[PDB]
Design a binder for these strands. Structure first.
Length: 107
RNA sequence: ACUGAAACUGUAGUAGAACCAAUCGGGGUCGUCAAUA
């Protein structure tokens, strides 16, 4: 279960697998370096739900995200999301803390 | 400036000899499963 920290989001694109670390950078061991955020955004899907403006696997999407904190780590919480053609709208304000998930306001 | 006639292409001969539809295989048995937050 510790091995999941060492995995980067990836997409194959032709004969290449292309890594997508996002705003964070791949540390030497493969974990997100120096406590920068998780390589993928978290799309709240079940316990809190962010429908478009429900997204499915492999939807190309454009979205706002907010850096949120829990425990030793932080991540980009998807705040609102649109299909890549649509417009995601104006910058959202400070998100609500969702239990132990605390907003940083970096959006 | 006188049509020849009459005559069974029949008679004898086994599409057959040899070749395995076969070779191997206990109707058997134990460790999880799942990936997030």
């Amino acid at each position: 279960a510790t091995m999941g920290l060492q995995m980067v989001p990836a997409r194959i694109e032709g004969d290449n697998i292309v890594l997508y670390p996002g705003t964070s950078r791949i540390g030497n061991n493969g974990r997100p370096a120096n406590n920068d955020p998780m390589y993928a955004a978290w799309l709240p899907y079940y316990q809190n739900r962010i429908a478009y403006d429900m997204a499915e696997h492999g939807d190309h999407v454009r979205f706002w995200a907010e850096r949120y904190t829990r425990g030793n780590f932080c991540y980009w919480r998807v705040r609102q999301i649109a299909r890549h053609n649509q417009n995601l709208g104006n910058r959202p304000e400070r998100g609500r803390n969702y239990g132990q998930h605390h907003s940083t306001g970096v959006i």
